[PDB]
């Protein structure tokens, strides 16, 4: 947290090295970040302190916290050709309890989208919006096709690209957030490249439990213009099926409507209503009132 | 009637379209259990996805493209100056016209910058204008009228 | 101060922003049309062999040519009672192999 | 609507394990339920 917070405050080019290495050497190491990661971080932060000393008022406050946090870790972790090899481990290990964190990797991407749009305060915004959209599409593809090598490559590319574009080319509370939320995406992604994809990846997400929350979220997702349609076509292109598109989309419609009926049938078994009982006046006056 | 005429014509249109599709799938059959080829999928799907992006982002983009334009340096043609004492006829009147109206050279703009370098509010104001936007009206000190 | 004369300045204002949003909504509902209730017309669009219906539709037309208008009425009654009984369409439209 | 939910979820399992011959045969059942209004009043009845 502190390594990344330093880059949000200082925003230099010296404090870029460590955040890149967190996302591409530490978080992608299977057993545990090794001694060499921690020693690199300690040595680099000491250097930057000396270099900035030998050259404003604020300069070495956040770096004092950093150095002292890295030496705390060391104390706990003491009380208890190479490139090819590193990559080989990640790609083919044996300590891979599998998990599915797509749901959430996506929510982070939605939240970002919103920040860019709401806080538009323009070519910059325009290009960035397209970028975020295009990353989301590629992400879905690698999920449905279950590739860990592809996700590794997408991570490497994106980490470097965002850390360069937003810290050299482009240049702000808006951009400070966008960054925090994209950092959470890069963390969750690395968990998936280290843990591996499961066996059953297809299906929806809100259609697992038949309650009332689920019904309202399902129906809400259908209202956002274009989401339902893009999901369907995207899943068709990447999943292996014998059916066309007309037929794919007719299976997906039957399922949506059978879900909604199922949810309503459940609610009326949990909360039954007596035979021959008038609908209460409050319900009537509320619904009707609004419509009128 | 007309309601019934038009219901016979609709049944025929749709029975034709089904018949055409049934024929094509007898001339070019597809094996049982054979996945739809990736090319077909990526083509059809691809287009649809693209259309959706171009119905959301592209409109905005075009409007923002329109907004990338310029402004025009409207230098004064005449700088008319009068000094009037009370109710009486002006003591002095002069009309500094085109030649007397001299746009700032890059040197005159650097001179202005130097003169106002001690005032950060003055430098913030000067930096909003180009050398072409700043004109010196050389108003002649003799009244152009008796 | 610099003056400003735009050429396509009709696309200006927050009313134009609101207009854009409204357009998206409308187009959105149009696209939904194709992806929503496509399960309600499966009875009339997934017919296995549409040949026996093509003969009835083409016989209504022959009768109109030779002006034997009494048989136009009796053949309209067959077409209307195929489309009014979902199960007699699963007998008329079956693959006769 | 429970027996239809099982057919819809079995089309999905087959897509996962790539046994695409059964995706075709289970699509045929779903399409012939929605093409015969009276076999939906047999499949969707409350089995009490």
């Amino acid at each position: 947290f502190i390594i990344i917070l330093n880059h949000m405050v200082t925003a230099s080019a010296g404090s870029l090295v460590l955040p890149v290495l967190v996302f591409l050497w530490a978080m992608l190491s299977i057993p545990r970040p090794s001694k060499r990661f921690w020693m690199t971080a300690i040595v680099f932060t000491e250097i930057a302190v000396v270099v900035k000393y030998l050259f404003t008022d604020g300069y070495i406050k956040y770096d004092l916290v950093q150095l002292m946090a890295l030496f705390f870790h060391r104390s706990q972790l003491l009380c208890y050709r190479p490139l090819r090899r590193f990559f080989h481990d990640i790609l083919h290990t044996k300590y891979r309890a599998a998990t599915d964190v797509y749901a959430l990797m996506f929510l982070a991407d939605v939240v970002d989208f919103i920040i860019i749009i709401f806080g538009f305060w323009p070519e910059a915004f325009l290009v960035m919006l397209l970028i975020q959209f295009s990353t989301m599409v590629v992400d879905r593809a690698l999920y449905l096709r279950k590739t860990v090598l592809g996700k590794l490559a997408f991570q490497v590319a994106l980490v470097l690209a965002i850390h360069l574009w937003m810290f050299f080319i482009l240049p702000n509370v808006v951009a400070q957030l966008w960054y925090f939320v994209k950092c959470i995406y890069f963390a969750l992604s690395a968990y998936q490249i280290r843990c591996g994809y499961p066996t059953r990846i297809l299906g929806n997400f809100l259609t697992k439990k038949y309650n009332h929350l689920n019904l309202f979220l399902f129906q809400g997702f259908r209202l956002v213009p274009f989401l339902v349609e893009l999901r369907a076509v995207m899943d068709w292109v990447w999943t292996d099926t014998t059916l066309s598109l007309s037929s794919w989309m007719c299976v997906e419609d039957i399922y949506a409507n059978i879900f909604i009926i199922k949810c309503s049938r459940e609610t009326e078994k949990k909360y039954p209503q007596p035979k021959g009982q008038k609908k209460k006046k409050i319900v009537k006056y509320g619904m009707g009132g609004l419509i009128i | 009637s007309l309601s019934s005429w038009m219901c016979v014509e609709d049944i025929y249109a749709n029975i034709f379209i089904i018949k055409c599709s049934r024929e094509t799938e007898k001339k070019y059959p597809q094996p049982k259990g054979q996945k739809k080829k990736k090319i077909v999928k990526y083509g059809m799907g691809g287009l649809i996805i693209l259309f959706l992006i171009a119905i959301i982002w592209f409109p905005l983009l075009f409007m923002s493209l329109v907004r990338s334009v310029v402004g025009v340096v409207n230098q004064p043609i005449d700088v008319t100056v009068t000094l009037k004492l009370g109710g009486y006829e002006p003591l002095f009147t002069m009309s500094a016209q085109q030649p007397s109206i001299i746009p700032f050279t890059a040197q005159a703009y650097e001179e202005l910058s130097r003169q106002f370098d001690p005032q950060p509010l003055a430098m913030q104001f000067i930096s909003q204008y180009s050398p072409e936007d700043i004109v010196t009206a050389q108003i002649e000190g003799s009244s152009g009228a008796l | 101060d610099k003056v400003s004369p735009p050429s396509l300045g009709f696309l200006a204002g927050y009313g134009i922003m609101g207009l854009y949003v409204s357009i998206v909504l409308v187009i959105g509902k149009f696209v939904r049309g194709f992806f929503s209730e496509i399960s309600h017309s499966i009875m009339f669009e997934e017919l296995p062999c549409v040949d026996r219906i093509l003969k009835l539709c083409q016989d209504i037309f022959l009768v109109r040519e030779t002006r034997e208008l009494e048989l136009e009425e009796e053949l309209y009654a067959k077409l209307i009672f195929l489309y009014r009984s979902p199960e007699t369409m699963i007998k008329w439209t079956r693959e006769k192999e | 609507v429970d027996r239809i939910l099982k057919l819809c979820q079995d089309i999905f399992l087959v897509r996962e394990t790539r046994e695409l011959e059964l995706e075709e045969e289970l699509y045929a059942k779903l399409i012939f339920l929605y093409r015969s209004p009276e076999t939906m009043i047999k499949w969707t009845r409350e089995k009490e």
């Binding site: - | - | - | 075709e24 045969e25 045929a28 399409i31 012939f32 076999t39």
Partner: peptide
């Protein structure tokens, strides 16, 4: 053939 499997359901599947 694919299209003779998709279009071949009967009333016997929806039996017991």
């Amino acid at each position: 053939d694919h299209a003779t499997v998709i279009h071949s359901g009967d009333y016997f599947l929806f039996e017991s």
